[PDB]
Design a protein around this ligand. Structure first.
Ligand SMILES: O=C(O)CC[C@@H]1COc2c(ccc(/C=C3\c4ccccc4C[C@@H]3O)c2C(=O)O)O1
Ligand SMILES: O=C(O)CC[C@@H]1COc2c(ccc(/C=C3\c4ccccc4C[C@@H]3O)c2C(=O)O)O1
Lengths: 150, 150
């Protein structure tokens, strides 16, 4: 349902993979650094996400993760409708690509404050979700989900 | 504030450390498997948590994490009031110990479905946060925070 729809997004930095889930209706994200995007990594990430937020539907980031039996197993396990990420709405791509740009910008802005990329990525998550644009993504996801629960 | 209060909790399984943050007012948790509880691990965990939920106050799980300059640095970074976890209210201990028991029980119930402990721990997180007792911890945290935002 709109409150339960998430989009996977994979971006690259420093020869490494940043896996992002975006809560579509709010722009709230969770993200992780992984060595490579595998079915297993994506599956584990989805499990973590769905344990933390009511994930009804995941638009996978690519066909490999859509196809991956490990990813399907995690979606099955976590009660997630695994969908493709075909941007039937073309604005989806631009929104995602812009977020990736923004996230990389923030990572660069914090990069020196931490030895490791994964720390910088979580700093970026924090900054992204708290950023007032004046509600934050964090406030929006909670509000959206709360309204839905009620 | 009651919606922003979290409690760190560290428990052990299979020669490994499960670090748990409990949202006190709701019972919602996030958790991770780490090799050992270090200041660095705790700091990184807190950063992740605070990027994801509005963490105003963290009651640390022990004095080492309370003392840790790395943990203080993360709390500073993430805007978290780092507090002790002294159970001035004695019911806190029993609540925490019971949750640890429950979490271990769930981990045991899923342990065979996954090769790795960390997967089983995230399964347990999922099960704990979705469990209806009939609202779930997941529903409660969102509601609490939503009410507060309003
Ligand atoms: O073992 C794992 O899971 C990863 C452990 C990570 C390792 O990276 C780090 C870590 C813990 C700390 C740091 C350093 C800082 C840090 C960490 C969190 C919040 C603010 C700050 C400010 C300060 O710079 C780093 C790092 O320097 O990147 O814990
Ligand atoms: O490397 C990292 O950061 C994450 C690594 C994780 C850890 O191991 C795993 C993994 C990915 C998958 C699994 C297996 C399963 C799994 C995982 C999630 C949800 C349901 C299931 C059902 C199925 O059993 C395991 C595992 O067997 O535990 O990737």
């Amino acid at each position: 349902s709109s409150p339960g729809i998430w989009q996977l997004d994979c971006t690259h930095l420093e020869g490494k993979v940043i896996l992002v889930a975006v809560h579509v209706a709010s722009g709230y994200i969770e993200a992780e650094v992984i060595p490579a995007e595998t079915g297993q990594e994506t599956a584990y990430f989805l499990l973590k996400l769905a344990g933390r937020w009511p994930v009804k539907t995941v638009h996978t980031d690519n066909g490999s993760n859509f196809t991956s039996t490990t990813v399907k197993a995690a979606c099955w396990w976590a009660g997630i409708k695994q969908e493709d990420g075909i941007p039937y709405n073309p604005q989806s791509q631009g929104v995602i690509e812009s977020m990736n740009k923004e996230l990389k910008k923030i990572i660069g802005q914090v990069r020196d404050q931490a030895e490791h990329l994964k720390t910088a990525v979580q700093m970026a998550v924090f900054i992204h979700n708290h950023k007032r644009k004046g509600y934050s993504a964090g406030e929006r996801i909670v509000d959206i989900i709360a309204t839905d629960i009620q």
